[PDB]
Point group: C3
Chain length 168, copies 3
């Protein structure tokens, strides 16, 4: 085991290769053993890479990368989760209940077709196409605003009485 810093990163079709230094070993190091999290630093980013050596056969060394120490989130007691590699204030946190996604902007879809923005308390749900609610009841503050809502009407200028409107 040996800690080395980080220079570059070559991405081949069998996985990621690092290029760690500490001793310019491997212009292309065997891996990054991905246990489901990954990231791409800019070249020469100040982070540590730990090499685990097969047998003691220097020959092959597998790498574990750490996110930069000064970018690590100080998780509260009882909580945990996943963060942005370079930003301790962007994360998905599991707490006592809040599956909490901390950012100002969230995108969903294969091409980011739904955008949720949260800025100065305004919540905006943006799409370039139709947004359709599929439920038996769609409400605002416990009032029906769905495909069955109606408006009461006042009497006209003649003094004739209106029914409620039909639905949308």
């Amino acid at each position: 085991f040996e800690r080395h810093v980080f220079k570059g990163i070559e991405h081949t079709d069998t996985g990621a290769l690092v290029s760690v230094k500490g001793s310019g070993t491997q212009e292309e190091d065997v891996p990054v053993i991905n246990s489901g999290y990954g990231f791409t630093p800019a070249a020469d980013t100040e982070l540590e890479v730990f090499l685990h050596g097969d047998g003691s056969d220097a020959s092959n060394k597998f790498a574990t990368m750490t996110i930069p120490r000064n970018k690590q989130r100080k998780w509260p007691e009882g909580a945990g989760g996943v963060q942005h590699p370079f930003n301790a204030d962007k994360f998905v946190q599991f707490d006592d209940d809040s599956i909490w996604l901390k950012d100002g902007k969230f995108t969903l879809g294969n091409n980011q077709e739904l955008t949720i923005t949260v800025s100065n308390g305004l919540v905006t749900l943006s799409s370039n196409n139709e947004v359709d609610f599929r439920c038996p009841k769609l409400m605002h503050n416990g009032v029906n605003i769905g495909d069955s809502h109606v408006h009461p009407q006042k009497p006209d200028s003649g003094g004739d009485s209106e029914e409620d409107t039909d639905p949308p």
Copy 2:
């Protein structure tokens, strides 16, 4: 340290056991040391398992599993996050801002009671029960559509004048 492939996986009430090969060691290997990410491959899935040996006491060996090399996401520079173990195109990415959830379908709740679907630009929010917005203002394109919205009315066929409708 030693790399071994992956055969099966027995899940007991103290954690996960692998069944790595490379040398048919352990029909049930001590663990999978879960640093918060986990997954279940089908038996004989082509992936590596790294054993870390206690003392040098072969006796006990702890395992780290990698997601398959050809399924690892090529993270863009500055970004990172978590992925599906067998699909590089399904993930939660932290970028410059986009807490980006890449899929066509997202489910929320203990029994998936809210489904968000994103398909061909259509966004659908589906529930088998009530969906209720709890806010001071509910808007579409900056027009009120909440529990206080009203419609202007035109004059009737008599030529009498209508007020705006009452709220929903």
Copy 3:
């Protein structure tokens, strides 16, 4: 390599320090090498810490923490993802499609300004400010409820005919 339990955790400005026991080594151990996931247990929480030793220089040892074995999620075949450190039933799962967030409550924003609650099938989207949909069409069950929806009207008490209402 050596497994040790977990006592405390000191968080400095270069990263996390553990305080593992098994042999009261390090009232403050070099690290927690964060590969993007982190968590904070209460002191003396029953979990394992694995030390990886630099050179063989006991001097410096880097730590990997595991989530407690009895709190590890039993991931279904083909699936994986990230979990709450102390709750196997709170997670973000990647499955065949469901980017599935399992909890009763989800918060979005820098100060949790949007809350999505899922309880007894009721879905509630709560904000202390405006929620605004920015799309060409906002629908419920395929009926327009957006900034262009109108209501049909019935004849009045005079028997005069109404037009559809104007938009909101």
